[PDB]
């Protein structure tokens with residue numbers, strides 16, 4: 001059984017808790033406490049491998065945490081979340097990437113770029129813009145909907161695959 005330590009980062013409000021609850025329990029949760037930082041487990045087989053996904057759902061701006069720190073330096077990959085209809089969120093992706101690298105002290109740290117809420121029409125970021133950013137980073141880009149559950153497993157399974165690859 002393989003264990004993979006993932007960290008879910010991104011501006012607050014983008015879909016971290018929803019994305020994560022969806023994978024974990026298969027239900028879209030709105031109303032999830034914006035401040036609750038918690039990690040969840042999920043046993044899943046990916047590509048014929050039995051995996052134990054230990055996910056840190058991050059929360060809290062400025063104020064530091066033992067758990068976040070640890071998961072941050074010890075995490076294997078990071079899901080970088082932004083909201084499709086929220087431009088600052090998207091623009092913030094570069095900072096989260098920059099923080100991850102500083103801690104890891106490394107360029108190649110696995111990540112996937114998640115453009116969430118692909119369910120909404122109130123769209124304010126183009127797939128094209130996001131794809132290209134993904135492409136500048138050398139990392140994949142997934143569009144998800146924690147609401148519709150669309151793309152949710154892809155996102156995380158892709159992240160696992162990256163990790164797996166980064167190991168080789």
Ligand SMILES: Nc1nc2c(ncn2[C@@H]2O[C@H](COP(=O)(O)OP(=O)(O)O)[C@@H](O)[C@H]2O)c(=O)[nH]1
Nearest residue numbers: 012013014015016017018030032117145146147
């Ligand atoms: N339409 C839509 N709303 C979503 C989606 N994901 C999250 N939400 C809403 O976005 C808000 C923030 O979600 P949440 O996961 O709590 O944000 P974060 O935990 O702070 O990253 C909530 O009101 C959720 O109901 C999504 O995929 N689509």
Ligand SMILES: [Mg+2]
Nearest residue numbers: 017033034059
């Ligand atoms: Mg949250």
